[PDB]
Design an enzyme around this catalytic site. Structure first.
Site, PDB file in Angstrom:
ATOM      1  N   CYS A 194     -35.412  15.607  54.384  1.00 38.65           N
ATOM      2  CA  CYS A 194     -34.759  14.308  54.321  1.00 38.65           C
ATOM      3  C   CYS A 194     -34.908  13.578  55.653  1.00 38.65           C
ATOM      4  O   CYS A 194     -35.181  12.380  55.685  1.00 38.65           O
ATOM      5  CB  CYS A 194     -33.278  14.470  53.952  1.00 38.65           C
ATOM      6  N   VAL A 202     -13.502   6.651  46.893  1.00 35.76           N
ATOM      7  CA  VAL A 202     -14.251   7.215  45.771  1.00 35.76           C
ATOM      8  C   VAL A 202     -15.294   8.188  46.303  1.00 35.76           C
ATOM      9  O   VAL A 202     -16.295   7.774  46.886  1.00 35.76           O
ATOM     10  CB  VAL A 202     -14.949   6.101  44.956  1.00 35.76           C
TER      11      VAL A 202
END
Ligand SMILES: Nc1ncnc2c1ncn2[C@@H]1O[C@H](CSCC[C@H](N)C(=O)O)[C@@H](O)[C@H]1O
Ligand SMILES: CCCCCCCCCCCCCCCC[N+](C)(C)C
EC number: 2.1.1.79
Length: 285
Positions: free
Chosen positions: A267, A69
């Site tokens: 990040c 997925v």
């Protein structure tokens, strides 16, 4: 149909241009936290180590059908096929990734069944043996979390297993209570990311994931954090994009270049101080 996948939000990022992403990701085009199993691994070796770490928790056997997925550019799928001899189905909302993986499928010399669909899990209704999802959960949104786990638990077999690898984070209005600095720089950081990099993106909390998983028939038998590994991964990505500044602006623009550098470096620092994390949840049916 019942749930319309957010194609535009996801494509806004991933369909920027394969050649652009190629400027900072390793050869396999893996776009997620690598695993520096050994401190001296190259980014590429570390990404394969992360793929094996994830796939090695699913009890794969030849002939099984693995569902990926959010397959990205297909590295995980193809390694499952080649290394573990399982059939595979990959789902992505990105047009470029679908087209790219389709080419890998067309040129594969392996006999196993491999399919890639420009579709969300929201539109996948086929029984599968095992499921793997790395870095896609963050795009589902708070309003799909429950729907996602319910679907995964349903499609999986009796003794099924899903390895959910996703970034997780602390709430800004909590980091402040414990007396930790830069709670505002963090909140501001999250806003920048969700509005300029990953539209519709949502930061999951470890408790949240644990809750939705259990409430949907899963038993999280293990939670493994790779937090320190992401800081490194991000530093390697930004290092590469910077040296490729010329090609970045040429293929895109200085605007995109500057924006992605702010994203990548920002990040890396938030992982470095530990305000955001990344965990692999082994979900047993
Ligand atoms: N609802 C949804 N259904 C299927 N894929 C989705 C999705 N929401 C986001 N994604 C996909 O999740 C991916 C995030 S990038 C991660 C790619 C890959 N798993 C890797 O680790 O390299 C993208 O491929 C995106 O298209
Ligand atoms: C490397 C990305 C770090 C994000 C940290 C938290 C900021 C925003 C909340 C997360 C929502 C979107 C996540 C998309 C993750 C995409 N990748 C799997 C491709 C890195």
């Amino acid at each position: 149909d019942e749930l319309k996948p957010h194609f535009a939000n996801v494509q806004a990022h991933y369909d920027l241009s394969d050649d652009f992403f190629r400027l900072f990701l390793d050869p396999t085009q893996t776009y997620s936290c690598a695993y520096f199993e050994r401190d001296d691994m190259t980014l590429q070796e570390a990404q394969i180590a992360k793929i094996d770490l994830a796939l090695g928790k699913l009890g794969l056997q030849p002939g099984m059908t693995l569902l990926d997925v959010g397959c990205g550019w297909g590295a995980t799928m193809m390694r499952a096929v080649e290394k573990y001899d399982v059939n595979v189905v990959g789902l992505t909302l990105s047009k470029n990734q679908a087209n790219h993986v389709q080419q890998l499928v067309a040129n594969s010399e392996n006999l196993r069944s491999k399919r890639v669909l420009l579709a969300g899990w929201e539109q996948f209704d086929e029984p599968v043996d095992r499921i793997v999802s790395i870095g896609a959960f963050e795009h589902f949104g708070h309003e799909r979390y429950d729907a996602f786990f319910s679907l995964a638990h349903r499609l999986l077999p009796a003794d099924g297993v899903m390895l959910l690898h996703t970034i997780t984070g602390l709430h800004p209005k909590e980091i402040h209570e414990r007396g930790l600095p830069m709670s505002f720089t963090f909140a501001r950081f999250l806003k920048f990311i969700v509005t300029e990099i990953f539209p519709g993106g949502r930061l999951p909390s470890i408790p949240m994931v644990q809750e939705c998983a259990s409430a949907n028939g899963f038993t999280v038998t293990r939670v493994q954090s790779l937090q320190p590994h992401y800081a490194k991964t991000l530093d390697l990505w930004s290092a590469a994009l910077q040296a490729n500044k010329g090609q970045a602006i040429a293929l895109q623009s200085e605007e995109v270049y500057e924006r992605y550098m702010k994203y990548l470096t920002g990040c890396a620092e938030m992982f470095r101080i530990g305000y955001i994390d990344v965990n692999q949840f082994t979900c047993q049916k």
